[PDB]
Design a binder for this molecule. Sequence first.
Ligand SMILES: O=P(O)(O)O[C@@H]1[C@@H](OP(=O)(O)O)[C@H](OP(=O)(O)O)[C@H](O)[C@H](OP(=O)(O)O)[C@H]1OP(=O)(O)O
Ligand SMILES: Nc1ncnc2c1ncn2[C@@H]1O[C@H](COP(=O)(O)OP(=O)(O)OP(=O)(O)O)[C@@H](O)[C@H]1O
Ligand SMILES: [Mg+2]
Ligand SMILES: [Mg+2]
Length: 246
Amino acid sequence: GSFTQQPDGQYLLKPCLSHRERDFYLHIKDDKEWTGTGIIPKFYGVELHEFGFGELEFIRMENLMYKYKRPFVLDLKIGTQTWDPETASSKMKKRLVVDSTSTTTSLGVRFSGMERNIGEEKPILYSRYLCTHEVNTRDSLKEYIKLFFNDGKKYRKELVPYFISQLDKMIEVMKKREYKMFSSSVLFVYDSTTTLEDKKYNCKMIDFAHNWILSEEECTVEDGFLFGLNNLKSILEDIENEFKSL
Ligand SMILES: O=P(O)(O)O[C@@H]1[C@@H](OP(=O)(O)O)[C@H](OP(=O)(O)O)[C@H](O)[C@H](OP(=O)(O)O)[C@H]1OP(=O)(O)O
Ligand SMILES: Nc1ncnc2c1ncn2[C@@H]1O[C@H](COP(=O)(O)OP(=O)(O)OP(=O)(O)O)[C@@H](O)[C@H]1O
Ligand SMILES: [Mg+2]
Ligand SMILES: [Mg+2]
């Protein structure tokens, strides 16, 4: 929402509309478990750029799809609720309904949108709003994730282990419960023209505008973030199992 959402430059320069995302990146900046594990985008720093009468703060981070020729993108929103203690009351009826009619309250993960580039471009776009109808069960979420790995010619079963390995690293850090994250996503991307060796594939946690730093502030409500990651991992392992029958 804060920038035109589509990437073949090196960077994303994301505006700071509140303190939370920038406080989080600054806080994990020296923690090798966040920054050497490859589980969040490479953080270049917070920067001031001219805006209005003065300056606006931005986060400079890596563009995860830099130099991708045929990008495939899947965004999965993580947690058992997508509201937090600061959510506006006028948004709450909708947040409550979407959380309960999607897989969010049951699995702690929900479909958020997908793009597949199968040579016939324009790309095929799958709306985030599919989550309360077409992708509203574990079985249908599994089918759409399989579809992400369908490059238009075959299932890219060889990429799935990378994705599980990434989720393992996320699980290991989030077990420590230093942060609560609401409305954050795991972004899965790959270039369908990649080989394994080219390493044009990525799996990162993103969007930290509603992150709470538990050593600094109270946040009583639960995020269910670790429950969601565990469920998503379990779905990917099911997919590995299912892709052997091919
Ligand atoms: O957070 P998302 O992606 O699910 O979508 C946001 C919408 O939520 P929904 O998907 O309708 O539950 C969200 O709707 P709400 O008004 O927050 O219910 C907005 O449309 C938001 O755009 P912005 O922050 O107003 O610029 C939308 O943000 P962007 O998709 O534009 O980032
Ligand atoms: N580092 C990145 N590289 C490539 N794509 C990204 C990156 N970060 C975000 N995106 C893409 O841009 C979309 C929007 O990003 P994000 O949700 O972080 O910001 P926002 O919607 O502008 O603001 P808010 O933090 O209020 O949601 C993501 O859903 C994802 O598709
Ligand atoms: Mg947004
Ligand atoms: Mg967002």
